[PDB]
Amino acid sequence: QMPIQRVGVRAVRHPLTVRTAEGETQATVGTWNLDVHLPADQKGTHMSRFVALLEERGGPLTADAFRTMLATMLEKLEARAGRIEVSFPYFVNKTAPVSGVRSLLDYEVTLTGDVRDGLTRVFAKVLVPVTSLCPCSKKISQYGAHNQRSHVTIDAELAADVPVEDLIRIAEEEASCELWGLLKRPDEKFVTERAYENPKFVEDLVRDVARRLDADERIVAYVLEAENFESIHNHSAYALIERDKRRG
Amino acid sequence: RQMPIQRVGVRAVRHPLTVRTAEGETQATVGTWNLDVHLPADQKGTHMSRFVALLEERGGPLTADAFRTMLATMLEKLEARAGRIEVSFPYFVNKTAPVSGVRSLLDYEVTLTGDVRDGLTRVFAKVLVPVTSLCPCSKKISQYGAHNQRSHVTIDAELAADVPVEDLIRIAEEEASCELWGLLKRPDEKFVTERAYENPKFVEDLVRDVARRLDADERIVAYVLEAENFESIHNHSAYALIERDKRR
Amino acid sequence: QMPIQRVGVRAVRHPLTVRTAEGETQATVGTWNLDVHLPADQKGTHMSRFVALLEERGGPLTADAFRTMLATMLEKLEARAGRIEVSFPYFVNKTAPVSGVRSLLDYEVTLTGDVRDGLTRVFAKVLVPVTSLCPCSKKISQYGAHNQRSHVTIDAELAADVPVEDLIRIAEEEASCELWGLLKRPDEKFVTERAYENPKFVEDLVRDVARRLDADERIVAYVLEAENFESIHNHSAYALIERDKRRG
């Protein structure tokens, strides 16, 4: 006797191909969460149809194909509102700072689509691993400064199409240092020095990243998180910034 | 860096906890704490150290009113005007088997959240209840048998007035095809298998039946109800979400 | 002043391509654990070299390439003993029982190589999701019978090259019913009936699977596990069988 906002399949693991900024087609494994709105006067959705769209679907998952999948799901399941969400690991070939030795780095990307109330919204979320270094530990200590691996997460509601790599760079750029999978000894020296030279508190990280998200038209709203897995503790330091530019 | 941060603090701090039962008995459980505060735009950083001190000093059972005293003490000790406390912990209920009566303990995952922002104190209670599901379709189409799977019903509830988790569990255990038990006897296995078969329910029916009972409690202003069936026939889960705010 | 049996990198996520029994090349994401033995008179291994073998390596990961990687690692790291281990999700296009509707299913495959004491050993481990159904619940109940999703894991030490798909079939074949991602209504009926018709206890599952591993020459030893995620309980039923045919 009541409508259900989300009703559908969840945790469907299924192969995916994305297209890199470099034009390459990247093959990965995704986890899909496809759901639809059920009108009160409807007893139940057709669950076999979700798995069928995933099997029928083909090609690289471009921004346009993503939107075409959301519409195809609503037409095939006979719905007016619904959401599609896929999570997958994404890889970028990076270049070491001094040696130039190429190596891959792994990011976690979640892509979401949602049509409700005649409005379609696309969301880009990337978790970017980075190195942080406390400025206090550096300032009060004769030698050394505590450093920890950090996870910067950018859940951005796109006003225009934004490459995930555009969000990864903002993260790596405003971080004390960015992670690389292979580092030569000349490279270990530079990363250890540049981090010490650029110590940033979690409040500084999220602030420095937010300013650049603020200044981007393609981002109408975003949730920004930064977690420092403190070496000196068994807990983490956490900071979240929420901004909807449509406010006002 | 001239920008406020809605949430800065410590994350994933495990620490021993004592809570108060509906009976008023105290249960000892381990908790994972999240303590964060709002940071003004002209403030460089909050005191991470103080958040842990509040956990070490705090003692005694975690009564609702005690949870509200802690949220104020946090703002008072970290010199903030807004902030949130989150704590999740396993919760046990001695259960009575349906036919034999053999007592057995069942575990649940409870999360309490308090939040002060814009001069409003809001308390939440989220519980995960483990329950059995049985497909109405399998039962009708098949000559014999009916596929059944373990389900997870999650009730996140903003409580205008305090409500025991026991009260939340009941709405889910009662509205499920059948409740779970740790110890069952041959008499009790027959009842659970027969009763579940006699009350088949789709993920859509389950959330709808739990919503109607959550809609009828004055204490619960708002809620986000989730039901996930781990389908035996597939390696993917069925899902349904109902969100209701009684203010709107 | 002492040797270290395993010393190296761990949790290196990195893209992988395997070749299916159907000749196809399957692209997936792997997690690598590459380690080497350190002689007492050696202070430390070269960790940058592990990541370099992964970046340098190419082609589908065939059984032969896997062995050639283990040797290349020992030669490149200047070791006499060492281990390589990659974990990745693997997909098979299955056909529904009555409708024939094709759909993918996801398995977790771990491949291990180890050279020690002049002996090289290759191990194949596949986790196969399956449906189980209690024979007691069926025997003591007027209607219905409890059914749960199960995970059958086969860690087999190969005496000859064995396709992972050969191990997945043994698992799906001796199970009450095998999982399919897309099932039509004719298909739901068959899977619900065949399971009820073939109820098997966890002790029966592992026994029925072991007999077929026993009778396979390509398997010199294996660890077999079966976990039933009981619908009627919040815990699981577990059975493990260990067999080394070289015993005697």
Added chain:
Amino acid sequence: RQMPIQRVGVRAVRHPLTVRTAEGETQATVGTWNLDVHLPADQKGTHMSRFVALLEERGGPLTADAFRTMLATMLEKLEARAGRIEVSFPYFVNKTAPVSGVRSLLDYEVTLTGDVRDGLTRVFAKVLVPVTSLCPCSKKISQYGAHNQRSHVTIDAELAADVPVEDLIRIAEEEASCELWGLLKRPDEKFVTERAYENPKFVEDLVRDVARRLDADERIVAYVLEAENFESIHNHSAYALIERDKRR
């Protein structure tokens, strides 16, 4: 089906636990239990129900001797001659900060295993100690700074004579670059940053230093020691394993 099963029983049963401290104080913690028995070849199946009954009836602190009484009661109640009990739980130790002395609790993950097979009773103790690591290479090559990461040292120890976990933690906390604390003050952050810098250690050095101290305890017949550095500079971990059996 004419084949023995080395391990049949229940898995992942969470249940509240009380353990005894080296001080003799009792600590309340939640446990996840694994109770299995050996099944003869001519036996169709063990009684799953009895395993949970043993957990409900059992009370009082989990003293070593009490753990050994439970292993016998299990074989006696399930009518078996071989079997294993495993229980893992968070463990806390009030810690004292190095300069200020501010007490703070730190958590560890402890796993106790008992095993009767071939008429031998074997007790084990596995603990995970959270510790900080600092690279000796970064310290030498770099002009300023030194990269540091949180590490996990795991000691699995077959105990001929009972040993408190406190004794295991000490060997790891002492042999690490620096121990972890929940609450630290500006004086204590300086000490930890300086001390860790003053005692750099490679994953290989750490396991080697912990082994020598584990080799010198008569109570510990055998052990598998693991050390994993979550390197800040990379998204992958350093690893080292040392396995020693003092019988061989």
